[PDB]
Nucleic acid binder design. Structure first.
Ligand SMILES: [Cl-]
Ligand SMILES: [Cl-]
Lengths: 386, 386
RNA sequence: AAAUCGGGAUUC
RNA sequence: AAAUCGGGAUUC
């Protein structure tokens, strides 16, 4: 029976194929794989006496950095390498550091950094023929919304390319069939047109302003589930929002943007709902200030963005580092790993994101469902409600 | 580039932790693990040119025997052992046999055997205090339903045991707390009382009659989803139904029964809905003949039983064996493996079922939700509807 | 966080 | 078969 010390473990993972961070049998989770590696490496033996997590990343949500707290066997001086050898390629342990007895992953978390990877073709306007396009274009009863000749040019180049290859065969419905093969090739051509799209500087600036609409303290009751507008804990403080320059990655050469959000605390699916709302405001040509209207008591249903693009970048423990460094305890700083994670993120997270995006068309499917859906549609009009 | 022959592969698996049989990235499925083992063993290289499955077992559904058809590399005389070495312990390949070019897993499937493992305490009447118990007992407006002094004795022995250990503390609501620990121990005592239950011969005979209500050809539109009563394909033929004698298995010594259903063809979630309906009829004390009323055009919502207890025992290919044996092709008979599967079923399927039942309380949670739910409730009364 | 029961709108 | 968007009733 070896001794056990209460330590914090810094880890990172691609969340694809796992049912979130929190241990939840019988479905594979990040924590179940971590525990299997711990047992196979000698970190634990045989509730797990004080187990703790900093963030319960949802189904499919990745994390460049996450932390847990537990009583481990630190006797092996090469225990980290053993655990990493016993782990799958998509999960890694960055470090192991001793913590004080009163350490609490969640209560000592001062802030959180999140990153969302979004394909730039998500900001193209809805396809002509969709209900959202019909309702937005037919919003000439109040001539407020942008014109967005860029999306018009994209869709019309797609129409010219389709017509120069599918001589009025003209796909209409389907529910192992030569028709289906024809349709398959049309949708593949449309996806290829999406992948060749390069966002303009104006659309990027518009999206940056729409995301900047989130800075400061706001009532985010519409950006979660089961939160009342009058609840005081519905107010959240976003410290910073940064939208990266566009960047091309992958064999299909598809364009992406990185959205880093630093906030004091977040509610369930807050990041994805914010991202989705900013994307809809940008791609529909609405005044970005309308995002602030979402803070009102009127309830709006914001469909959360796909989990595939979400990464928990790092939890932050400001008070712990500032007020417990005199006790000899090492500070918890994920940036000390920043380069290593940066490699892992590119090799085992971002690559998975690009592969699943080009294989299953996650983002385009999400936005095609939004496009064809008869609360949010009203908000994205020229006229909202009140 | 090795040659490839079109073969059929006989496999078995525990479905826990997998998203069904059909290959469906990015979530792990039985077929994705099979393909990984195939690649690692040399069975395939690099749609999969004619891939076929006999049955698309749902999420969590096991199978003592399932079959697939594909073009494999059969050059290795020890290819089966290599694939099995490359497979996890919960998935096994029983055999590989050559098939004719026109072979079609699903179209040549003449019938199907299914097995459902049900804990006998699922047949105990609803707990006094539940809405279902209140509605059934208060069905004295039409004095039709059984009395079931056995369930009364069970619940009253539980009440005597609880009161002799929890002196009117008396748990009332909860939503890390000493109360919760008390409640935890009450529910554990109730679960232990359930695990010690041994079904009487009368209840077993009643359940056997309720299941026999399914024999022959019937309209099973209520025993699936999205099937209209007037659709001719809503009629299904059950060739045989056998309920095994009760048997005790596991460390907690819990009692189980095996329900084997041989049918020509089945609709989506038909087995689980039939099982659930028979169980409700038995545990509520209804005339078993009322099950035939479910074949009427009136729509009833039958909650499907947990997937944990379902096994696809074997698909059957009668016509293929009878009309293609002269062509030199070996018959496809899963019974030729019956002993081997029988070991695997006990070591990697039934054991998982018992462990998950005693760890997560799947069946009792399902029936506790049924018990407290304000269409089916009306059917389980003395008065149905019409 | 995850899972269940159903009901509604979609996706090779 | 699986997956998505939501809405409703539940489960350490
Ligand atoms: Cl999350
Ligand atoms: Cl199934």
């Amino acid at each position: 029976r070896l001794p056990k010390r209460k330590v914090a473990v810094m880890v990172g993972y691609c969340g694809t194929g796992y049912h979130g961070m929190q241990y939840n049998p019988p479905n594979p989770t990040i924590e179940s794989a971590l525990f299997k590696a711990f047992v196979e490496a000698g970190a634990i033996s045989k509730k797990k006496n004080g187990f703790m997590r900093a963030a319960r990343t949802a189904k499919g949500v990745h994390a460049g950095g996450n932390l847990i707290s537990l009583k481990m066997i630190i006797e092996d001086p090469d225990i980290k390498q053993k655990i990493n050898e016993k782990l799958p390629e998509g999960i890694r342990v960055w470090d192991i550091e001793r913590v004080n007895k009163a350490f609490d992953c969640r209560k000592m978390c001062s802030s959180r950094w999140y990153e969302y990877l979004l394909p730039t073709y998500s900001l193209i306007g809805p396809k002509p023929g969709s209900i959202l396009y019909r309702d937005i274009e037919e919003s000439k009863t109040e001539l407020v919304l942008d014109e967005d000749l860029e999306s018009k040019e994209f869709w019309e180049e797609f129409k010219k390319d389709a017509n120069e290859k599918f001589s009025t065969e003209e796909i209409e419905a389907i529910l192992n069939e030569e028709l289906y093969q024809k349709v398959k090739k049309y949708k593949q051509l449309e996806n290829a047109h999406r992948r060749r799209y390069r966002i303009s500087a104006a659309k990027l600036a518009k999206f940056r302003a729409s995301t900047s609409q989130y800075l400061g303290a706001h009532n985010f009751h519409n950006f979660t589930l089961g939160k009342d507008f009058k609840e005081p804990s519905a107010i959240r403080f976003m410290k910073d929002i940064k939208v990266s320059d566009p960047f091309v990655i992958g064999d299909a050469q598809t364009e992406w943007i990185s959205i880093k959000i630093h906030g004091q605390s977040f509610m369930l699916h807050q990041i994805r709902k914010m991202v989705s709302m900013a994307t809809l405001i940008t791609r529909c040509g609405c005044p970005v200030e309308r995002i602030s209207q979402a803070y009102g008591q009127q309830k709006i249903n914001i469909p959360k963005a796909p989990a595939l693009g979400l990464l928990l970048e790092a939890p932050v423990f400001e008070g712990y580092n500032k007020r417990l460094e005199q006790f000899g305890y090492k500070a918890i700083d994920f940036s000390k790993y920043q380069d290593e994670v940066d490699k892992f993120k590119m090799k085992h997270i971002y690559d998975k994101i690009y592969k699943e995006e080009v294989d299953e068309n996650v983002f385009n499917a999400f936005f095609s469902y939004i496009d064809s859906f008869n609360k949010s549609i009203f908000e994205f009009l020229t006229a909202k409600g009140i």
